[PDB]
Amino acid sequence: ADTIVAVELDSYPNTDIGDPSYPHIGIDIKSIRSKSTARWNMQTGKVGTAHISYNSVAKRLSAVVSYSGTSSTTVSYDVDLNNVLPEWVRVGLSATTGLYKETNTILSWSFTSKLKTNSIADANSLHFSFHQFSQNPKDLILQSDATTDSDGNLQLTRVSSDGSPQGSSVGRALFYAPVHIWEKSAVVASFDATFTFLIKSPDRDPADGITFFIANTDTSIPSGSGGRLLGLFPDAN
Amino acid sequence: ADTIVAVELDSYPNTDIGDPSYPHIGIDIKSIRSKSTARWNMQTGKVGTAHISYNSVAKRLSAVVSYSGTSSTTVSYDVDLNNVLPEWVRVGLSATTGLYKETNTILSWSFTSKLKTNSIADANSLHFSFHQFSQNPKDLILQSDATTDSDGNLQLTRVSSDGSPQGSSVGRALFYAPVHIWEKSAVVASFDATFTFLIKSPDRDPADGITFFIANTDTSIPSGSGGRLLGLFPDAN
Amino acid sequence: ADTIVAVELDSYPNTDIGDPSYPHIGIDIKSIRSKSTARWNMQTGKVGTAHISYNSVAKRLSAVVSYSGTSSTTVSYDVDLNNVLPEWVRVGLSATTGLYKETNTILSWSFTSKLKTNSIADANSLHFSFHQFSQNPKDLILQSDATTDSDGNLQLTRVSSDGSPQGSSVGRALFYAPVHIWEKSAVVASFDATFTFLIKSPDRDPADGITFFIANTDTSIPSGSGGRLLGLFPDAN
Amino acid sequence: ADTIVAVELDSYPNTDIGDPSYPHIGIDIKSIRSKSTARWNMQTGKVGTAHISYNSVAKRLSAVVSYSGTSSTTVSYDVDLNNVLPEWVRVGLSATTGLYKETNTILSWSFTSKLKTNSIADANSLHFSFHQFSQNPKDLILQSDATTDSDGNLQLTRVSSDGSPQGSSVGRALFYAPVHIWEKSAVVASFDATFTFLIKSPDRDPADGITFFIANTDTSIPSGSGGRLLGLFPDAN
Numbered sequence: 001a002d003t004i005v006a007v008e009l010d011s012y013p014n015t016d017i018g019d020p021s022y023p024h025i026g027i028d029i030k031s032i033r034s035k036s037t038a039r040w041n042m043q044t045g046k047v048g049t050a051h052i053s054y055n056s057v058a059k060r061l062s063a064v065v066s067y068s069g070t071s072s073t074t075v076s077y078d079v080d081l082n083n084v085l086p087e088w089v090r091v092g093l094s095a096t097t098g099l100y101k102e103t104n105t106i107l108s109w110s111f112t113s114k115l116k117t118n119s120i121a122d123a124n125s126l127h128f129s130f131h132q133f134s135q136n137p138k139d140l141i142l143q144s145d146a147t148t149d150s151d152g153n154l155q156l157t158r159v160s161s162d163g164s165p166q167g168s169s170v171g172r173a174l175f176y177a178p179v180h181i182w183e184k185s186a187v188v189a190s191f192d193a194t195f196t197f198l199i200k201s202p203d204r205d206p207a208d209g210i211t212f213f214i215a216n217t218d219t220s221i222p223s224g225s226g227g228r229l230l231g232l233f234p235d236a237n
Numbered sequence: 238a239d240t241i242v243a244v245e246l247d248s249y250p251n252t253d254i255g256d257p258s259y260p261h262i263g264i265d266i267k268s269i270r271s272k273s274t275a276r277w278n279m280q281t282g283k284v285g286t287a288h289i290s291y292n293s294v295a296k297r298l299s300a301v302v303s304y305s306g307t308s309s310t311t312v313s314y315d316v317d318l319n320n321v322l323p324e325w326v327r328v329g330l331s332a333t334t335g336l337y338k339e340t341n342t343i344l345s346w347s348f349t350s351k352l353k354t355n356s357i358a359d360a361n362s363l364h365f366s367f368h369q370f371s372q373n374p375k376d377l378i379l380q381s382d383a384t385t386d387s388d389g390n391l392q393l394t395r396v397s398s399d400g401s402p403q404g405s406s407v408g409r410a411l412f413y414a415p416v417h418i419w420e421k422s423a424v425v426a427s428f429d430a431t432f433t434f435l436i437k438s439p440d441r442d443p444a445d446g447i448t449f450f451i452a453n454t455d456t457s458i459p460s461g462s463g464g465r466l467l468g469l470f471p472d473a474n
Numbered sequence: 475a476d477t478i479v480a481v482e483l484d485s486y487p488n489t490d491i492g493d494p495s496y497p498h499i500g501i502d503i504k505s506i507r508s509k510s511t512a513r514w515n516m517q518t519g520k521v522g523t524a525h526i527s528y529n530s531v532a533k534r535l536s537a538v539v540s541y542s543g544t545s546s547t548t549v550s551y552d553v554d555l556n557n558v559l560p561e562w563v564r565v566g567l568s569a570t571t572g573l574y575k576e577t578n579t580i581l582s583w584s585f586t587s588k589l590k591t592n593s594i595a596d597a598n599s600l601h602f603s604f605h606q607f608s609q610n611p612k613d614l615i616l617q618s619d620a621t622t623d624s625d626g627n628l629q630l631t632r633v634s635s636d637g638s639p640q641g642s643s644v645g646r647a648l649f650y651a652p653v654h655i656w657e658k659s660a661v662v663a664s665f666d667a668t669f670t671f672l673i674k675s676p677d678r679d680p681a682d683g684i685t686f687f688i689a690n691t692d693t694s695i696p697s698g699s700g701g702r703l704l705g706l707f708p709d710a711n
Numbered sequence: 712a713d714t715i716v717a718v719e720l721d722s723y724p725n726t727d728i729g730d731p732s733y734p735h736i737g738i739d740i741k742s743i744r745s746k747s748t749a750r751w752n753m754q755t756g757k758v759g760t761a762h763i764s765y766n767s768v769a770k771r772l773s774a775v776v777s778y779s780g781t782s783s784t785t786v787s788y789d790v791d792l793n794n795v796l797p798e799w800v801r802v803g804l805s806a807t808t809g810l811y812k813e814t815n816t817i818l819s820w821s822f823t824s825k826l827k828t829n830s831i832a833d834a835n836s837l838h839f840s841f842h843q844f845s846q847n848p849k850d851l852i853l854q855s856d857a858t859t860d861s862d863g864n865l866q867l868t869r870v871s872s873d874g875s876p877q878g879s880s881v882g883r884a885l886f887y888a889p890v891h892i893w894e895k896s897a898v899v900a901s902f903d904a905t906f907t908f909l910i911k912s913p914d915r916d917p918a919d920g921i922t923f924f925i926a927n928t929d930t931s932i933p934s935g936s937g938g939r940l941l942g943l944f945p946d947a948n
């Protein structure tokens with residue numbers, strides 16, 4: 001199976017698979033059953049921002065999800081990620097809908113990785129920043145239902161021509177280049193990511209959520225990973 | 238055919254195809270026959286540095302190639318590159334040997350592209366930096382004879398197990414992700430690249446050289462592009 | 475006297491001191507009488523963006539000033555700036571009003587300088603980015619009338635409590651740290667700057683303009699530099 | 712008194728003021744008596760690298776100090792630094808000698824601060840990088856005995872003309888511009904620093920150490936802060 005580390009913006013509480021009974025953000029290490037979660041009062045119809053960070057010295061993966069003037073939700077988990085993940089990875093965004101639905105719209109996305117040693121210059125770095133998305137994003141690997149729209153937004157899950165969200169959808173976008181996140185000789189490795197998003201929904205209980213994730217380079221949407229599994233996992237183990 | 242823009246570090250004068258009669262650096266726009274050149278006193282056995290820059294406002298592609306304490310060679314050419322190149326490209330390094338030979342060793346390579354509009358943050362950016370190369374560089378597309386060695390260096394052309402250079406070799410390394418260098422709505426696009434290199438040779442007249450190049454995303458080594466054509470062009474037109 | 479290099483966004487044509495007879499952008503090298511200008515259809519009441527760039531290899535100082543959907547104005551000048559300027563400088567924004575007036579409001583400002591040699595890491599770099607300004611910007615040297623307002627904007631010239639611009643005003647903001655733009659041993663030096671601005675005015679012919687400028691570290695507003703001299707020069711020589 | 716947060720590379724065990732009985736690295740929050748320490752096998756005569764990082768979400772200040780091929784020493788401490796420090800600070804390096812001595816030579820130093828909100832672009836950033844130091848470093852505030860030498864190195868403490876270290880010395884270097892590390896409206900603030908150093912000594916027990924520190928902007932060497940107090944504190948409380 002794939003090897004997954006993710007930060008989930010989980011709009012829909014699936015208490016039968018261990019979610020808290022409220023919308024939440026979470027840190028997922030090789031399981032949909034988050035190792036740490038925080039209560040997230042998600043604001044449908046408003047643009048949110050997520051900031052995710054990690055470095056191999058502190059060994060604390062953290063995320064903050066904010067809406068301007070309203071809320072800042074934070075979650076952290078202590079984990080040696082370079083122990084969990086392979087040395088080379090791809091990074092990506094995923095989203096799903098299931099029986100219930102929402103737009104999973106990404107307006108911008110940036111990422112930086114550094115692999116350092118014995119200099120003020122990091123032996124290796126990758127950075128990308130998208131403040132919008134082109135009609136043919138040749139530097140993204142689009143998986144499942146993911147597409148870019150005429151506004152320059154990345155629609156992870158299916159929307160109709162009027163922008164209405166559809167159920168039973170799954171989509172992912174990976175950055176095209178593999179990222180070298182560890183080498184046995186590294187002194188420190190770090191990564192940071194930010195994205196902005198817009199979740200709209202006509203449903204009283206929108207679903208299912210958005211993730212930022214890191215995986216083996218050849219990662220693909222698992223069979224049966226729809227809805228509550230966020231396009232990341234084949235099961236709820 | 239491919240669409241090529243390159244900066245050539247041309248060690249071997251092929252006067253029959255328009256080279257000056259001395260080792261030189263040059264700006265190549267869709268032809269091996271450089272649009273501008275400068276005399277390059279290349280120092281075999283010494284580590285050199287090349288810095289290349291362009292922005293769409295100034296429209297001047299420039300390169301400087303230096304060896305510490307000895308020489309700084311500069312070449313520039315006025316050209317609207319975003320007119321010449323497609324909107325999406327891959328960036329790369331090439332090298333060849335022919336009847337004569339040299340190591341074409343890359344010790345480090347960095348690149349930054351920016352596509353800007355109406356903000357102090359560039360609507361799009363890609364950056365990578367390699368201060369060494371891994372044994373399996375999953376973020377490089379290696380073409381022809383190019384490989385990485387046990388010292389962490391990128392050997393563009395064939396070297397034996399003792400490091401001796403071989404003739405009749407061609408190799409290229411592309412960064413894995415396509416780069417978005419223009420959009421019709423862009424206010425300014427720019428790129429910068431630096432690499433360090435080591436050319437060693439037992440030959441009295443080493444050959445053939447190293448380039449940094451930008452091309453259509455699906456670029457491949459053309460048939461008949463060995464030696465004097467630097468792995469870039471099918472002919473000397 | 476100070477040593478000044480500037481990019482001027484000159485809203486008011488002072489034809490008696492060599493301005494073209496229309497609002498214009500210009501490159502100023504030690505004189506208010508621009509070495510190169512371009513016609514600028516300035517859009518009062520709209521947020522503009524200016525992007526300025528230079529590197530010591532190309533030796534071409536360029537600027538582009540844009541308003542989204544309307545206009546992109548470009549000006550360039552070939553000059554060896556590291557010949558004109560001292561090795562250490564301060565960088566800044568200036569603005570004036572005179573008999574006629576306008577707001578000279580800066581919404582954001584970023585700057586990067588690099589001094590490079592023989593590595594993919596630039597022997598020296600300074601970068602700052604302000605996407606807003608604090609009520610006490612301790613990393614700015616405010617000169618003359620310059621202040622920050624309750625919206626987080628930098629008002630270079632005097633505005634009343636309702637935001638109405640005042641005549642006979644001059645103001646500048648320098649970044650606090652000196653910038654090392656040249657060393658005799660440098661292989662390449664470069665700088666880039668971006669700012670966004672908002673010029674509003676009740677006057678039929680607004681004045682006087684905004685500049686980005688580079689100067690000796692101890693630069694100060696010259697006596698008699700108001701209005702048409704943009705807070706930069708003691709006279710119109 | 713000043714408000715100090717520091718990472719200490721403490722070469723000399725002062726057990727009478729709470730040091731461990733071995734050379735160590737440590738996290739100092741408003742006291743020389745470190746909140747967390749780690750055993751540091753310091754290699755006199757070898758170039759070391761220190762990497763320091765923090766972000767306001769994780770709230771974990773970490774440092775790693777390494778010598779290539781030999782050792783990597785790590786220390787971390789959970790602390791809300793934006794609670795401890797004022798909103799505006801200066802950042803710096805300090806060093807001392809006392810009865811015993813060592814060179815406190817800085818070969819390079821870089822720093823990045825970010826203050827973020829609701830965008831993939833950080834509402835505020837400052838970065839500097841010095842891969843060497845000029846004879847008149849106009850962007851450093853040199854305090855006490857600190858000077859730059861003819862090799863381009865920053866000698867924090869006094870060395871004779873042959874490079875021999877002197878006792879009873881204290882010196883600091885601050886970056887010239889204040890740094891904005893917090894604002895009440897910030898979603899996340901972070902900083903990172905790296906420096907490389909060379910400690911040489913003829914003494915069997917070299918002293919006293921080097922720090923990277925963050926302080927109120929108007930920070931100065933306290934009276935009585937020599938030797939074991941690392942030029943940071945007026946006493947050992």
Ligand SMILES: OC[C@H]1O[C@H](Oc2c[nH]c3ccc(Br)c(Cl)c23)[C@@H](O)[C@@H](O)[C@@H]1O
Nearest residue numbers: 012097098099100101207208226227228
């Ligand atoms: O999109 C929201 C959720 O819809 C489905 O789960 C249900 C949510 N409410 C229900 C009510 C009845 C039944 Br049967 C089901 Cl499967 C569900 C499933 O698709 C879940 O995976 C998903 O998390």
Ligand SMILES: OC[C@H]1O[C@H](Oc2c[nH]c3ccc(Br)c(Cl)c23)[C@@H](O)[C@@H](O)[C@@H]1O
Nearest residue numbers: 249334335336337338444445463464465
């Ligand atoms: O590697 C150096 C050069 O070697 C070959 O050209 C010759 C250089 N000296 C010669 C001498 C004789 C003959 Br025949 C040839 Cl082809 C050459 C050809 O392979 C050239 O493309 C290449 O630039």
Ligand SMILES: OC[C@H]1O[C@H](Oc2c[nH]c3ccc(Br)c(Cl)c23)[C@@H](O)[C@@H](O)[C@@H]1O
Nearest residue numbers: 486571572573574575681682700701702
């Ligand atoms: O602010 C616009 C301009 O106003 C003044 O110049 C005049 C513009 N129109 C005029 C009409 C009459 C007289 Br007298 C003067 Cl000085 C001016 C002077 O302050 C100029 O320096 C400035 O560029």
Ligand SMILES: OC[C@H]1O[C@H](Oc2c[nH]c3ccc(Br)c(Cl)c23)[C@@H](O)[C@@H](O)[C@@H]1O
Nearest residue numbers: 723808809810811812918919937938939
């Ligand atoms: O430089 C090393 C140390 O030297 C001095 O402390 C002593 C170290 N060994 C000693 C032996 C005797 C006496 Br008295 C003293 Cl003060 C010391 C003092 O200067 C200390 O602050 C410093 O840490």
Ligand SMILES: [Ca+2]
Nearest residue numbers: 010012013014
């Ligand atoms: Ca869920």
Ligand SMILES: [Ca+2]
Nearest residue numbers: 247249250251
């Ligand atoms: Ca040739």
Ligand SMILES: [Ca+2]
Nearest residue numbers: 484486487488
């Ligand atoms: Ca004018």
Ligand SMILES: [Ca+2]
Nearest residue numbers: 721723724725
């Ligand atoms: Ca001590």
Ligand SMILES: [Mn+2]
Nearest residue numbers: 010019026034
């Ligand atoms: Mn969940």
Ligand SMILES: [Mn+2]
Nearest residue numbers: 247256263271
């Ligand atoms: Mn040639």
Ligand SMILES: [Mn+2]
Nearest residue numbers: 484493500508
């Ligand atoms: Mn003018």
Ligand SMILES: [Mn+2]
Nearest residue numbers: 721730737745
């Ligand atoms: Mn200690």
